[PDB]
Amino acid sequence: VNKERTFLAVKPDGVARGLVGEIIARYEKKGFVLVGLKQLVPTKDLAESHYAEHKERPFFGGLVSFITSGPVVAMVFEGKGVVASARLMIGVTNPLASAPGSIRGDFGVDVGRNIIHGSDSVESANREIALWFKPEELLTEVKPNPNLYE
């Protein structure tokens, strides 16, 4: 189904490095539809909720701290297979190991400064979308380019 959504957040390092438009352009080119978009400085509450899966790990504190250290551009993209496809376009956790062509492969060097977050599953996408966005902030009717889908 073509109404799958994923959550992506350009983290404060990616925003600070002027990569917001380069990243959005990659997903627009791919044919995914921008369905929500805003810049914000995450609060502590949202951050801990965002990273709640790690909350028993020692590196949780660092994650929460970093993501609330500056502006973040949160976005929701819609399309077929968007959750896995967007991960593939991101690269792997370690930017040094991410293939050239991928966002982290092209732009990143350090795990802790790896530019962008993308949901790792449809279920984490749905939780993250409902976390970061109000329903009113999301397009209800989406029309993609007619040349994208059969």
Q: Is 111 in the site for its own copies (CB under 8 A)?
A: yes
In the block, tokens 């190991």 appear at 97
In the block, tokens 């509450």 appear at 45
Q: Is 99 in the site for its own copies (CB under 8 A)?
A: yes
Q: Is 22 in the site for its own copies (CB under 8 A)?
A: yes
Q: Is 61 in the site for its own copies (CB under 8 A)?
A: no
Buried-exposed string 80-109: b where 16+ CB fall within 10 A, e elsewhere: eebbebbbebbbbeebeebeeebbbbbbbe
Residue 11 annotated as lining a ligand binding site: yes
* Residues in contact with its own copies by the rule CB under 8 A: 12-13, 15-32, 34, 36-41, 62, 66, 71, 73, 79-81, 84-85, 88-89, 91, 96-97, 99-103, 105-113, 137, 139, 143, 145, 147-150
